[PDB]
């Protein structure tokens with residue numbers, strides 16, 4: 001419908017694929033009018049890609065190890081940054097005029113199509129260092145130029161933790177001090193999970209399972225309808241997975 | 251010199267007094283041209299007030315337990331909020347046109363007089379919930395009206411944790427979405443202490459020892475010039491305390 005605009009996510013393996021399936025199913029559930037796109041690598045199994053195609057309108061293959069890939073020369077300088085370099089291809093999707101990137105470890109609790117009212121680069125503050133934006137949810141404008149500049153910066157600067165957040169904050173360095181409309185409310189990337197969430201946590205639009213253990217790393221027990229050691233968000237992830245993802249398998 | 255403008259802090263006991271002495275000494279060290287004010291209660295010992303008068307230009311006594319105090323009726327509704335109600339008296343200081351409130355558990359690493367270029371209410375984002383501002387450092391305009399409204403809100407709403415942050419964020423509820431100039435850089439209230447601090451943590455202007463254990467709760471050992479179990483900020487606090495506070499005692 002709005003074929004010109006997309007939610008874009010990323011998976012480089014079958015584990016994070018499970019996250020993308022929950023994310024995508026949650027966006028469908030809350031009736032997005034936009035396209036759903038997943039960047040996938042050849043490390044994602046063919047069988048899992050078949051499941052991704054039931055949720056996503058486009059499963060777009062990216063392989064930074066292929067010498068024909070635009071990021072390949074950069075990977076040879078920074079071989080440790082394969083995942084980040086795959087992610088940056090989100091900017092190469094110039095068939096779309098505007099997109100919202102979302103991490104595969106996010107989950108949507110309401111329609112968030114009003115994010116397309118925003119301009120590049122709009123993003124929520126990161127907890128822990130809130131003059132940096134968290135790069136798990138952001139509104140951007142695909143551009144070969146912007147893409148090539150991000151590649152250059154990745155080449156020059158690298159990434160201590162292998163993430164793209166430092167690079168995106170270096171490139172978009174006016175975010176902290178310029179144009180409050182480019183600060184997404186924290187409820188669009190609620191990543192503190194693990195008094196304020198009493199008052200405002202009920203109005204979350206997006207939950208982000210930022211940090212070491214992802215929901216799919218838990219062992220789910222049908223017998224108790226919970227995981228094994230606000231646990232609510234974790235339960236909701238698994239609720240979407242069991243109710244909405246599993247039956248796509250028919 | 252700028253007798254019209256002040257840094258204002260707060261202590262209700264001799265422990266936090268030690269914090270105020272380090273804060274005040276750090277502001278002097280970095281050559282503030284503004285006045286230094288501490289709100290103190292009768293629970294602060296006379297002997298400690300004599301030490302506070304060597305650092306602070308005004309030691310202003312506030313006693314919410316006195317029926318002549320403006321906050322006393324509010325305290326009888328909310329007897330658990332004595333400290334917060336004392337703090338709110340910062341707005342009653344109408345001999346000043348503009349002030350920066352700072353928590354007694356902060357410490358200054360550079361001249362921060364450029365905070366007086368800001369307008370009420372300017373404050374840094376709180377880590378953990380960054381659409382709320384942390385109420386440990388803020389620029390405000392003393393006003394009997396604003397004061398009386400904050401008292402009313404404290405009366406109506408109370409405070410789950412006994413802090414003023416919720417009240418100040420409720421009253422100043424446009425902060426997250428309005429006027430980026432009212433967002434202080436995080437380096438003016440660096441309260442994550444305990445990759446980003448590698449890049450930007452060297453340029454801190456204010457450190458805030460937010461959380462349970464305050465620097466003065468540690469046991470300092472002259473023999474090692476450290477505390478007993480970035481530990482640097484903690485060492486600096488104790489460096490100011492031993493070098494700059496102690497010899498005020500002559």
Ligand SMILES: O=c1ccn([C@@H]2O[C@H](COP(=O)(O)OP(=O)(O)O[C@H]3O[C@H](CO)[C@@H](O)[C@H](O)[C@H]3O)[C@@H](O)[C@H]2O)c(=O)[nH]1
Nearest residue numbers: 010011012013016103104105135136163164165166210211
């Ligand atoms: O092996 C991997 C690792 C990551 N991803 C994708 O990359 C995203 C980011 O990884 P994630 O594990 O979610 O990182 P966070 O725990 O969210 O860590 C934070 O810090 C990093 C920035 O430096 C960013 O990658 C994250 O968006 C940011 O929230 C994931 O959601 C996936 O979409 C993969 O596909 N495969």
Ligand SMILES: O=c1ccn([C@@H]2O[C@H](COP(=O)(O)OP(=O)(O)O[C@H]3O[C@H](CO)[C@@H](O)[C@H](O)[C@H]3O)[C@@H](O)[C@H]2O)c(=O)[nH]1
Nearest residue numbers: 260261262263266353354355385386413414415416460461
């Ligand atoms: O017994 C006390 C307790 C606090 N204070 C003063 O109140 C300030 C705030 O208390 P603090 O212990 O610093 O709280 P934080 O650990 O900083 O906790 C956070 O959350 C609270 C808001 O709800 C605020 O009081 C703080 O500014 C905020 O940073 C202190 O610095 C002192 O100035 C006293 O004088 N006596």
Ligand SMILES: [Mg+2]
Nearest residue numbers: 152153156157
């Ligand atoms: Mg360069």
Ligand SMILES: [Mg+2]
Nearest residue numbers: 402403406407
């Ligand atoms: Mg009212």
Ligand SMILES: [Mn+2]
Nearest residue numbers: 103105136210
């Ligand atoms: Mn993530």
Ligand SMILES: [Mn+2]
Nearest residue numbers: 353355386460
């Ligand atoms: Mn404090």
